[PDB]
Every structure is written in structure tokens, then in C-alpha cells.
Motif scaffolding. Structure first.
Motif, PDB file in Angstrom:
ATOM      1  N   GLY A 131     -96.525  -0.953 -42.144  1.00  0.00           N
ATOM      2  CA  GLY A 131     -95.121  -1.295 -41.996  1.00  0.00           C
ATOM      3  C   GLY A 131     -94.238  -0.094 -42.255  1.00  0.00           C
ATOM      4  O   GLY A 131     -94.514   1.023 -41.803  1.00  0.00           O
ATOM      5  N   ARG A 132     -93.161  -0.318 -43.010  1.00  0.00           N
ATOM      6  CA  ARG A 132     -92.286   0.782 -43.394  1.00  0.00           C
ATOM      7  C   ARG A 132     -92.962   1.752 -44.355  1.00  0.00           C
ATOM      8  O   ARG A 132     -92.538   2.909 -44.446  1.00  0.00           O
ATOM      9  CB  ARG A 132     -91.001   0.240 -44.020  1.00  0.00           C
ATOM     10  N   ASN A 184     -84.213  -4.158 -40.512  1.00  0.00           N
ATOM     11  CA  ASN A 184     -85.434  -4.737 -39.942  1.00  0.00           C
ATOM     12  C   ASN A 184     -86.572  -3.748 -40.164  1.00  0.00           C
ATOM     13  O   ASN A 184     -86.880  -3.443 -41.329  1.00  0.00           O
ATOM     14  CB  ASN A 184     -85.158  -5.133 -38.490  1.00  0.00           C
ATOM     15  N   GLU A 185     -87.217  -3.231 -39.122  1.00  0.00           N
ATOM     16  CA  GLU A 185     -88.290  -2.264 -39.301  1.00  0.00           C
ATOM     17  C   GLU A 185     -87.788  -0.832 -39.439  1.00  0.00           C
ATOM     18  O   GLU A 185     -88.596   0.065 -39.706  1.00  0.00           O
ATOM     19  CB  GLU A 185     -89.279  -2.353 -38.136  1.00  0.00           C
TER      20      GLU A 185
END
Ligand SMILES: N#Cc1c(-c2cccs2)nc(SCc2cccc(CC(=O)O)c2)[nH]c1=O
Ligand SMILES: N#Cc1c(-c2cccs2)nc(SCc2cccc(CC(=O)O)c2)[nH]c1=O
Ligand SMILES: [K+]
Ligand SMILES: [K+]
Ligand SMILES: [K+]
Ligand SMILES: [K+]
Ligand SMILES: [Zn+2]
Ligand SMILES: [Zn+2]
Lengths: 334, 334
Positions: A181-182, B147-148
């Protein structure tokens, strides 16, 4: 003097996919002289040096840096809490025995911190009993969480009850942060994710009544408690403001437990170290290095030698004195 | 004197589920006198008092607490970055206008920090330009991530470039942390999730090159930067040890950016505040309160005023001086 935070691996170990019948494990390959690779189902993720497994090399670099004793524990990626319990216990026994042999080879320079099958508490209690009585380990190393369990989970209370009964110290090391993800950039799981994990673990044991139910349980947290020494005010204030959310499993304010647990001194900065000793206590900070990984202290204890604010009694407490207290050992390593 | 961190809601706004055709929005329902309920699709998640919307009540409390000016920003739950861009923009016009009408009614007690539809950078630039030129706001409040996207994402650079040009300051507020699973207990999203969301945001801006590429951008982070003042040593060290993971978008070390951004002083404890000014700088820490929510500071400036280590010149910088320099405003407030 004493380095409470150091990792070691066996020189080799069998194919764990063959031994257990499913993937997800970590292996080791000696591809050239002095170096080795750590793999996960074929995909390399890190290269380590001889000092990760070879005690001869470690003793050499220990004398060079002035270190007297290393508290040896496994690399946290080996915790394997995700696997089937019987298979994790098998691996724990393999890793604990190699530790015991390395310690008994140099009892004046090494102590052992075992690994437990934390996903199965009834099995972890038994392996802890074997680690203390048979292997003579002063403590064990466990993660900041066990799958969906934080260290507040009631299922883990027999393990705490056994550790308090066995006088077995706990070293709580962060692991199993979000890797994608991040967090798949800028080394964020190591720089930010691991301190957050430790902070969650400290809060979870405090508000889960762990320190309250087991007052004699001796716990140490890695990386200076993560963010806890700085964010304790926010956490303490939030407990006061919303006891309906925070005071249901343990009614005591988190500031009451300052001085009831240890952290290591691995914070890299003098300002961070002073706040650490100021908040946690000069008796509850222990020198740790994360040897032999490069994110740790290159010159063990240099940050404590440089603090002009500490007297000599306090420097010797952080260097070795507090380690003896947390481990429950005496000065037998001259 | 000046509170940079305070939230306000409109007294009313229409049914957003019917306005936009889908659910997931926040509504305010008045159930008693001086009290109201916040609903997320019918389900309450907190009860707020009249001081969350009524500017008259805020003025009375500000006089009684000694606050000259509040920087009004919306409540982060209204960010709505998850919704359709044209719907979030519709909500931003509603929130910013209502924010604007409260400023014109008491123009020496309030300055506005509007909200932007950050999931559509081109719309965000439009609405922000409208906020500065047509509404007169000296800045906006944005989340720690969209968000991302983290605040390093090149998609958001049009927002930063317009901010440097429009002389519009950025107050970055943590939001959209994990709310379920392991974080569903002990108020962890607010006590641990929020400070970690902010630590990630500072790292992404530094390692993404935002401060290097926009050196005149004025950015303030909430809650004393989360964990950054305490863990900057580890973050700086991890940058130097792995340039292949961190230094691929910006070669400068994170330490070189101590002094390139602001944080509020909302850290609750004296030792945390002293470290905050030691790392971030006496000219880069701003008084923030999180008014009117209970996790903030009940009596603004009381912690700062109690610091014997600070001189009077420093206290005035934290109380109002740094807020004015960050917001880029002069003493138009008597
Ligand atoms: N990415 C990445 C990456 C990985 C992994 C990826 C997936 C599973 S592990 N392992 C290493 S080896 C040192 C180490 C390995 C495991 C735990 C710790 C705890 C500590 O001492 O701080 C350190 N180095 C890396 O950079
Ligand atoms: N859990 C829970 C919970 C919730 C929510 C649950 C799901 C969405 S919000 N809201 C409130 S109200 C004040 C507020 C709401 C939203 C953001 C902020 C940022 C700040 O601290 O200034 C404050 N209080 C709670 O305890
Ligand atoms: K012990
Ligand atoms: K489990
Ligand atoms: K401005
Ligand atoms: K204060
Ligand atoms: Zn480690
Ligand atoms: Zn806030």
C-alpha cells in the motif's frame, strides 16, 4: 558493555517448506565467502554478513567496540506466528537450541532470548518452561502483536502468568507491519511502521491490564518505546477524556505505569535520548544496538558516552546496569 | 493569543445522501438545547455542544480563555476525499461559504481555513483560488493523505504550486486512519493512528521533494508533528543508510528540513513541548487547541505559559507570533 538488542541466526537450517509442507518461510544461502542471502520462496529480500551467524566474528567485533555481553535473539522475521502451531513450535525449538549452544560456548559473552509459538499459548508456555529450566534463558523475545491479537488479548494471559512465575523477561520487538500500500516506499515500515507497532504494544499492555495483573512481569520495548515517550501526554490525556473507550479493561491512567517497564536506548539522537530517560526513567533505559543491522547503532554506546548531562553512575546504568536488572542477572561477565 | 487549530461545523446542511445519490456522509441533528448529534447514515458517533457551530458561544468562550483569534477549519470527517470529485467540491463550496460568513461577522476573532476536494487536483486548485481571492482565506486545511496518494504524490503538485503562488498556507490534519480491526479499541485511531498519520505525511513531503521544489510553501502539521520530533533521529539515520529506498526522489537528508515547516504545540506534556521547540524550532511552533473537542487543550496556552524554560519572547512567538508568520498576516487584531 551490554547490548540488549542484537540478532543472530544459525549457520544453516533445513528447507522449511520440505519440513512442514507449505510455503512462507525464510531460508539462508551462502552464495559467496563472508556473505549470505535471506530468501522467502526464492525471492531475496536482504543480504547479511558473517556477523549474523558466526559467533567467532561477533566476539571479535564485540571486543573492538568495547561490548562485553550481547543478549542474542533471533531475527524477528522468524517469529512465524502465522504458521500452524505445531510447526512454529518445531522451529522455535530449533532456533532456541542453536542459541543455547552459542551461549554455552561463550557464557561470559552471551545470553539467550528465546522464541515462542505465541499463536498457541498452551504450547508457548511449555516452550518457555523449557527455555528457562533446561536452556537457562533469562528471557524470550516476542512480537508487538500475534496475528489479530494485540498484547492485551486474554488468550495471552497464561503466557504472561507463566513468564511472571518463571521470572522470564520479555523483550517486545515490533514486526509484521504493513509492507504494501502506501507503506511500500521510503522504507516506511522500518522508519515509521515499527515505532507505531511498539506504541500500540505499550498502550495495549497498559490498557489491557497486563502490568496491573502481573506486577512482577518484566517487559522491555524496542526502539525506545517507539513514539510513546513523546505521545504519552496525548495518550494519558485521551484516557482521562474518554474513560468509556480506554478504561474498560484497566481503570488506571497510563501514566501510572511509567517506571513499570523498560525500553532500549536506540533513538539515535541526544534530544530523543534525554526525553527517553526523562520519561521512562534512568533505571529503565537499556543500551541496545540492533546488531548487526545497519539501521542500528554503529558505535555501541557512543550516544550515551556523549551525553554531558548524565553523571557516571547514570551512564553505567544505561550501558549495563539496567540490563542486569531487567534480565535478573548478576555481574558474572568480567 | 491565537489558536491555529480549531474546528467548526455549519449549524445546518441538507441531506447529503439525497443531494448526491449515495451514502457515507455526515449529518448534524439537534436533539436537545445546546447539544447536537453527528450521524453517519443514522448512526451516532459523537454528541457535540453548541460551541461547535454557534459563533456567539465561541466568542464568549474565547474571551473567557483569553483567545484573540481562532483559525476556523472544518471537521476532518467532512474532508470527503472518497466521494465523487464534483460532489466533494459541492460540499467544499457549502463549507467554505459558511466558513466565510462566520469570518465577516467577527473579522478580528476569526480567519478561515477552507477545505478542498483533494481527489481532483484541478478542481482543488479552482476552489482554493476562489477561497483566497473571493473569500479571503489565508489558507486551507487538508488531510495527511488522499486515498492511495500520500503528500509526495506528483498528482497533488498542482495544489502545492498554486499554494506557493496564491500565498496560501497549508494546515495538514491527520485523518482517514484505520478505524477497525486491531485499531478498533482503546481510542487507538485518535491516540496512535492520528500521530502516525502525521509522521507519514511529514516523511512523504520531505522525501517527495515538496519543500525543495516549493521553498516558499508554508505548511503546518497538527499535534506537534505526531511522532516526528522524537523519531527524526531514526528517520534521518534510515535515510543515510538506505539511499536506494528513500533518496530516489530527493537526495537531501530529512534533518536539513528541520525549520522548513510548522507544527502546532498540541502535545499536552511539558517535556514533549520542550522537545518540540528543540527539534522544530522556537519560530516554527504554533499554539493549537483542537477546540472544541475534549482531546484538545481546555485552557489554551496554559502549558506554554507554565514553561519556566521559555523566555517571554519565546512564549509570545508560540502564543501568536508564529501563527501570524505562518498565516502570513499582520496584527490587524488590535
Ligand atoms: N523490505 C525489506 C527488508 C526485509 C524484509 C521484507 C519482507 C520480510 S523481511 N528484511 C531486511 S534484514 C534485517 C531485519 C529483518 C527482519 C526483522 C528486523 C527487525 C530489526 O532489527 O529492525 C530486521 N531488510 C529489509 O530492508
Ligand atoms: N470513533 C470515533 C469518533 C468519531 C468518528 C468515527 C467515524 C468517523 S468520525 N468522531 C468523534 S467527534 C470530533 C472529530 C471528528 C472527526 C475528526 C476529528 C479531528 C480532531 O481530533 O480534531 C474530530 N469522536 C469519536 O470518538
Ligand atoms: K529473567
Ligand atoms: K493469533
Ligand atoms: K497565507
Ligand atoms: K499551551
Ligand atoms: Zn531489532
Ligand atoms: Zn483537530
Amino acid at each position: 558493555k551490554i547490548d540488549i538488542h542484537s540478532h543472530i541466526l544459525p549457520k544453516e537450517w533445513p528447507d522449511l517448506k520440505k519440513r512442514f509442507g507449505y510455503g512462507g518461510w525464510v531460508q539462508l544461502q551462502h552464495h559467496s565467502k563472508g556473505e549470505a542471502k535471506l530468501l522467502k520462496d526464492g525471492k531475496v529480500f536482504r543480504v547479511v554478513r558473517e556477523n549474523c551467524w558466526d559467533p567467532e566474528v561477533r566476539i571479535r567485533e564485540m571486543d573492538q567496540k568495547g561490548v562485553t555481553v550481547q543478549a542474542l535473539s533471533t531475527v524477528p522475521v522468524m517469529f512465524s506466528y502465522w504458521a500452524k502451531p505445531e510447526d512454529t513450535l518445531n522451529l522455535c525449538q530449533l532456533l532456541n537450541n542453536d542459541l543455547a549452544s552459542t551461549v554455552v560456548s561463550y557464557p561470559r559473552r552471551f545470553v539467550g532470548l528465546g522464541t515462542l509459538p505465541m499463536q498457541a499459548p498452551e504450547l508457548a508456555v511449555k516452550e518457555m518452561e523449557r527455555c528457562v529450566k533446561e536452556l537457562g534463558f533469562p528471557g524470550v523475545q516476542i512480537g508487538t502483536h500475534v496475528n489479530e491479537w494485540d498484547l492485551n488479548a486474554q488468550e495471552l494471559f497464561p503466557v504472561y502468568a507463566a513468564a511472571e512465575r518463571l521470572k522470564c523477561s520479555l523483550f517486545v520487538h515490533p514486526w509484521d507491519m504493513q509492507m504494501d500500500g502506501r507503506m511500500a516506499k521510503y522504507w516506511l515500515p522500518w522508519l515509521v511502521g515499527m515505532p507505531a507497532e511498539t506504541t500500540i504494544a505499550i498502550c495495549s499492555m497498559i490498557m489491557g491490564g497486563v502490568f496491573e495483573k502481573f506486577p512482577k512481569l518484566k517487559v522491555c520495548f524496542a526502539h525506545g518505546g517507539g513514539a510513546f515517550p513523546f505521545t504519552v501526554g496525548r495518550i494519558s490525556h485521551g484516557f482521562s477524556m474518554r474513560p468509556d473507550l480506554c478504561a474498560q479493561d484497566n481503570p488506571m491512567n497510563p501514566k501510572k505505569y511509567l517506571g513499570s517497564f523498560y525500553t532500549d536506548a536506540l533513538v539515535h539522537d541526544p534530544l530523543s535520548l534525554k526525553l527517553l530517560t526523562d520519561v521512562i526513567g534512568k533505571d529503565k533505559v537499556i543500551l541496545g544496538t540492533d546488531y548487526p543491522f545497519p539501521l542500528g547503532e554503529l558505535e555501541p554506546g557512543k550516544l550515551i558516552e556523549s551525553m554531558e548531562e548524565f553523571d557516571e553512575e547514570t551512564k553505567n546504568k544505561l550501558k549495563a546496569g539496567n540490563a542486569l536488572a531487567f534480565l535478573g542477572l548478576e555481574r558474572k561477565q568480567f
